[PDB]
Structures are given as structure tokens and as C-alpha cells.
Amino acid sequence: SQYLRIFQQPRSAILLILGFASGLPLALTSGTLQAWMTVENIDLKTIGFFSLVGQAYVFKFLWSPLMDRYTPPFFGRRRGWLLATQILLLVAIAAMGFLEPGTQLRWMAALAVVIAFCSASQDIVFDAWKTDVLPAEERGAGAAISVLGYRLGMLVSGGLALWLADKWLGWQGMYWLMAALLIPCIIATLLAPEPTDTIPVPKTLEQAVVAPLRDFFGRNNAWLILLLIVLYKLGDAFAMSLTTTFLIRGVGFDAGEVGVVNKTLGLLATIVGALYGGILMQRLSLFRALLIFGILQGASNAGYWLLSITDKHLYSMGAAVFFENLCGGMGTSAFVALLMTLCNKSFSATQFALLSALSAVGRVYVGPVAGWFVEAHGWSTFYLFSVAAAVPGLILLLVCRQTLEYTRVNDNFISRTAYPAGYAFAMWTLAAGVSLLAVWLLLLTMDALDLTHFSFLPALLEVGVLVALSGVVLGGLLDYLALRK
Ligand SMILES: CCCCCCCC/C=C/CCCCCCCC(=O)OC[C@H](COP(=O)(O)OCCN)OC(=O)CCCCCCC/C=C/CCCCCCCC
Ligand SMILES: CCCCCCCCCCCCO[C@@H]1O[C@H](CO)[C@@H](O[C@H]2O[C@H](CO)[C@@H](O)[C@H](O)[C@H]2O)[C@H](O)[C@H]1O
Numbered sequence: 001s002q003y004l005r006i007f008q009q010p011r012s013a014i015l016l017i018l019g020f021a022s023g024l025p026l027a028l029t030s031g032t033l034q035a036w037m038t039v040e041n042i043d044l045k046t047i048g049f050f051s052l053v054g055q056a057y058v059f060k061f062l063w064s065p066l067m068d069r070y071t072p073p074f075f076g077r078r079r080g081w082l083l084a085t086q087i088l089l090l091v092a093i094a095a096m097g098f099l100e101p102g103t104q105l106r107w108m109a110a111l112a113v114v115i116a117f118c119s120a121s122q123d124i125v126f127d128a129w130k131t132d133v134l135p136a137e138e139r140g141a142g143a144a145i146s147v148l149g150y151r152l153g154m155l156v157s158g159g160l161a162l163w164l165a166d167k168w169l170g171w172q173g174m175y176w177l178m179a180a181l182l183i184p185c186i187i188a189t190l191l192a193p194e195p196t197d198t199i200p201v202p203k204t205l206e207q208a209v210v211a212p213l214r215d216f217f218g219r220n221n222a223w224l225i226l227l228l229i230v231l232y233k234l235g236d237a238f239a240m241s242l243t244t245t246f247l248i249r250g251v252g253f254d255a256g257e258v259g260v261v262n263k264t265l266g267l268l269a270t271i272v273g274a275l276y277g278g279i280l281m282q283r284l285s286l287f288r289a290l291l292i293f294g295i296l297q298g299a300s301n302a303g304y305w306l307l308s309i310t311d312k313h314l315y316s317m318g319a320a321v322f323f324e325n326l327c328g329g330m331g332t333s334a335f336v337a338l339l340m341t342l343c344n345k346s347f348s349a350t351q352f353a354l355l356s357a358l359s360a361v362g363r364v365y366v367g368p369v370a371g372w373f374v375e376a377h378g379w380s381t382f383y384l385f386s387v388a389a390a391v392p393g394l395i396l397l398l399v400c401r402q403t404l405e406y407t408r409v410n411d412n413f414i415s416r417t418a419y420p421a422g423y424a425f426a427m428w429t430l431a432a433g434v435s436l437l438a439v440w441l442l443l444l445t446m447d448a449l450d451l452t453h454f455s456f457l458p459a460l461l462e463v464g465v466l467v468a469l470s471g472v473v474l475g476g477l478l479d480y481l482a483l484r485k
Pocket of ligand 1: 063085
């Protein structure tokens with residue numbers, strides 16, 4: 001009853017519809033396309049242009065500040081951009097089908113790049129719309145319903161699309177149908193609620209760029225929260241990186257069985273776990289849910305440790321995969337809720353995109369290290385290390401209880417006034433490190449244009465990441481000292 005009420009309310013359907021519209025764009029630019037172009041034997045000539053469509057989704061934060069300042073002529077900051085980024089995908093996705101892959105491959109690639117760029121903006125504005133309107137109690141269930149819509153969109157965009165195209169309809173008509181299925185999405189955008197008009201908006205574009213950073217870094221506890229955001233998901237990334245390879249080699253299973261088992265059980269478990277986490281969060285506070293969910297996520301992948309020693313069996317694999325996926329989808333909703341709470345209403349999506357990118361910066365480094373650890377200590381000890389690698393996230397969450405308990409009851413963050421002498425040094429060092437990484441990115445994009453070549457590529461990135469880590473460590477230590485005193 002009280003746990004059930006959330007589903008009947010009409011805004012839930014709008015959230016799901018707007019979620020499915022994010023998926024239909026993701027697979028009509030990289031995956032169904034190649035399947036279409038396999039008739040024309042996609043070459044290496046167009047990959048130079050085609051390298052950007054995958055890249056728009058990773059680098060969305062840089063063009064994000066433009067979204068908050070600007071507004072469409074009518075409809076307010078967050079319900080006008082969704083009408084503008086859901087009318088452009090429709091004019092391009094259908095048209096793209098008008099082209100012929102015989103002699104217009106470059107035009108097709110350029111249209112794919114434009115479609116990806118539009119989808120990135122729609123995604124960021126939709127995240128801002130989610131964070132602005134949703135109240136304090138229902139955030140987890142909203143995130144779960146959005147994830148369910150996302151998955152139901154990706155599945156329709158790939159599977160049923162391929163089946164229809166190669167059975168009845170044809171490729172051009174499959175593209176036409178994937179274009180025409182966006183009309184309900186724009187209807188839902190038009191009929192959805194809006195953020196209030198009380199909240200102020202930045203007056204200058206440079207102000208839009210600079211204000212969110214000064215607002216987030218002028219908090220009582222900022223560096224500790226940054227460290228928690230970075231280090232929450234390590235214990236899941238480590239196991240998810242090589243679970244498939246372990247199930248292939250260390251146990252003795254076949255590729256098809258592993259693929260099928262993942263492709264069904266992982267989806268079902270993730271969906272059920274996310275919805276359960278949202279329903280339970282609807283009545284439970286943020287900190288207790290975060291702690292319990294983190295402990296469960298850390299203790300989940302001991303099933304893999306049990307599997308590694310014991311001999312092969314189908315049901316053991318099924319149970320372990322089901323449990324791991326349920327615990328992961330269970331904690332992902334709590335993490336999304338924690339990300340959503342911190343940002344303030346006025347500058348929402350810039351502070352959401354930067355935090356989301358900082359969340360995913362963890363997966364880049366763990367990859368090669370996961371490779372080295374296996375040859376060092378066998379398959380089995382790797383998973384014990386995975387179990388023990390979730391301790392820092394729980395410890396940081398335990399230390400940072402005060403701010404999360406105060407925010408729920410006061411709905412605002414206390415400004416920083418303790419130890420004002422040492423924060424400037426850390427901020428300046430972090431700025432210098434980010435500037436160094438920007439210089440490295442400029443060097444990489446200068447080299448990739450074949451205008452010139454540089455021999456200083458990896459060392460600059462290593463130095464910059466070392467400087468950034470040192471700055472964040474100094475900030476965290478100073479914050480801990482201030483909290484103790
Ligand atoms: C409804 C609103 C929609 C808003 C967005 C619409 C965008 C439509 C079209 C945009 C085309 C943008 C072209 C930019 C060209 C200049 C930049 C460039 O060439 O960067 C290259 C460089 C490296 O590319 P490769 O060499 O292929 O990488 C190889 C890696 N191994 O690119 C990158 O590093 C990342 C990609 C670019 C990220 C975004 C750059 C900034 C934004 C550009 C366009 C968005 C609008 C900006 C202006 C807004 C105000 C008018
Ligand atoms: C200094 C700023 C922060 C660091 C910037 C450089 C590192 C960026 C993070 C590491 C690279 C991976 O970055 C991450 O890529 C995945 C790729 O699917 C993106 O994935 C995204 O997929 C779709 C895109 O519409 C979203 O619905 C989803 O929520 C999101 O995760 C993330 O938005 C991005 O953050």
C-alpha cells in the first residue's frame with residue numbers, strides 16, 4: 001500500500017517515457033548502423049570522421065555550461081531544451097535513411113556524428129530535469145524507473161529493430177520506424193511538469209561557467225565527498241572488468257552459455273534490484289540506505305570466490321551471477337540518489353555532469369592493474385582482493401555522516417570558514433593539474449590531426465594525474481583536520 005503507491009501516480013509514466021527516449025538514439029549510431037553497412041563493407045577510410053560519434057558521450061561536460069544560461073523562447077530552462085533536442089533527433093534519424101550507402105558514406109558518417117551530439121545534449125537536459133523536480137523521498141524509485149526505461153529503450157533499439165529489418169520491413173524502413181517512434185516522447189515532454197520560476201539564473205555565460213565550481217568548493221566538506229564519489233565503485237569495477245574472462249577460462253564453461261546467462265539473468269536481476277532499491281529508499285533515509293547497500297555490494301562478490309574453488313556447475317554460476325547483479329543494481333540507485341542530492345537547483349546539470357564524469361574516471365586505471373594482479377596471485381586471490389577493496393568507500397561514508405545527516409534536515413550546506421589558509425594552495429594545485437591535462441589533450445588532438453608528432457605524450461599525463469591526486473589528498477587531509485578540530 002504505502003510502499004506500492006508510487007507506481008500509480010501519473011508522473012511515473014512520464015519518467016519512463018522520457019527514459020526510453022534516451023536509448024533509441026544510443027544504438028542507431030554505432031551498432032545497428034555497422035550491421036546495415038556490412039552490405040557495403042565498411043572500410044578504414046571513414047573511421048577518421050567516425051571516431052567522434054563514440055567520443056561525444058564521454059566529453060559532454062565541456063559543452064554543458066551553455067545549457068543552464070540559455071533558455072528557449074517559451075517553456076523555461078528545462079522543458080524547452082527537451083523540446084529542441086527531441087525535435088532534431090527526429091529530423092535527422094529519419095532523414096539519414098533517405099541517403100544511399102553507395103556514394104554518400106561521408107555524409108552518413110557526418111549525420112551519425114550530429115545525431116550523437118544531439119543525443120548527448122538531450123541526455124544532459126533530461127538529467128537536469130530529473131534532478132530539479134523530484135522531491136526528497138522518491139529519488140531512488142525515480143532513478144530506478146528511469147533505468148528501466150533506458151534498458152527497455154536499448155533493447156527495442158537493437159534487437160527488435162534487427163529482427164524487423166532482416167525479416168519483414170527492410171533497413172530504410174527500420175530507420176523510418178526508429179525515427180517515427182519518437183512522437184510519444186515529445187508528447188511526454190510537452191505534458192510533463194516544470195521547475196519553479198523562483199530559483200535565480202546566472203546573468204553571464206562566464207558566470208555560468210565559473211559559479212558552480214565556486215559554489216561546490218565553498219562547502220564545509222567537499223574534498224572528502226569527492227574522494228567518496230571517486231572510491232565508491234572500485235569494488236564493483238574490479239570484479240566486473242574480468243568476470244567474463246574468469247567464467248570462460250578459470251572454470252571451464254563455453255562462450256555461448258556464458259553469453260546467454262549474462263544477457264538474460266543480468267538484465268532481470270539489475271531491473272529487479274534497482275526497483276527494489278528505489279521502493280525501499282522511498283521510506284528509508286539516505287545515509288542508512290547508503291551504508292547497508294554498500295556493505296551488501298561489497299559482500300556480494302564472495303559468491304565468485306566460492307565458485308572459484310568449487311568445481312563447475314550451471315546452477316552455482318546462475319545463483320552467483322544473479323546475486324551479484326541484484327546487489328549491483330541495488331546500490332546503483334543509492335549512488336544516483338547521492339549524486340542527485342549534492343547539486344543545487346540553480347546550476348544543476350553542470351554540477352551533475354562533472355560529478356558523473358568524476359564517478360567514471362575510476363574505471364580507466366583499474367583495467368591494466370586487474371591484468372597484472374591475476375598473473376601475480378592466481379584467479380582465486382583476485383576475488384578476495386575484490387572483496388577487500390570496498391573498505392575505503394565504507395570508511396569514507398562512515399566519516400562523512402555529519403554532512404549527509406544535516407542536509408536532510410536543513411536542506412542547505414554550511415559554508416566553509418575553518419582553516420582558511422591552506423585551502424587556496426590545494427585549489428591552486430588542482431587547477432594547475434587540470435591545466436596540464438588540458439595541455440596534454442591539446443597535444444593529443446594536434447598529433448591525431450597528423451600535422452605534427454610529439455614524443456612527450458605519456459609523461460605529461462602521468463605528471464598531471466600525479467599532481468591532481470596530490471592536490472586531492474591534501475584537500476582531504478585538511479578537511480579531516482578541520483572536522484576533527
Ligand atoms: C541543440 C543544441 C546542440 C548543440 C551541439 C551541436 C553540435 C553540432 C556539431 C558539432 C561539430 C563540432 C566540431 C568541432 C570541431 C573542432 C574540435 C575538434 O576537431 O576536436 C578534435 C578532437 C580530437 O578528435 P580526434 O583527433 O578524432 O580524436 C582522436 C582520438 N584518438 O576532439 C576531441 O578531443 C573531443 C571532441 C570534441 C568535444 C567538444 C568540443 C567543444 C564543442 C564543440 C561543439 C559544441 C558547441 C560548441 C559551441 C557552443 C556555443 C555556440
Ligand atoms: C576532470 C573532469 C572529470 C574527468 C573527465 C575525464 C574522464 C571521464 C570519465 C572516464 C571515461 C568514461 O566516462 C563515462 O563514459 C560513459 C560511457 O558510456 C558515459 O556513459 C553514459 O551513458 C549514457 C549516455 O547518454 C548515460 O545515460 C549514462 O548515464 C552515462 O553513464 C559517462 O557519462 C561518462 O562519464
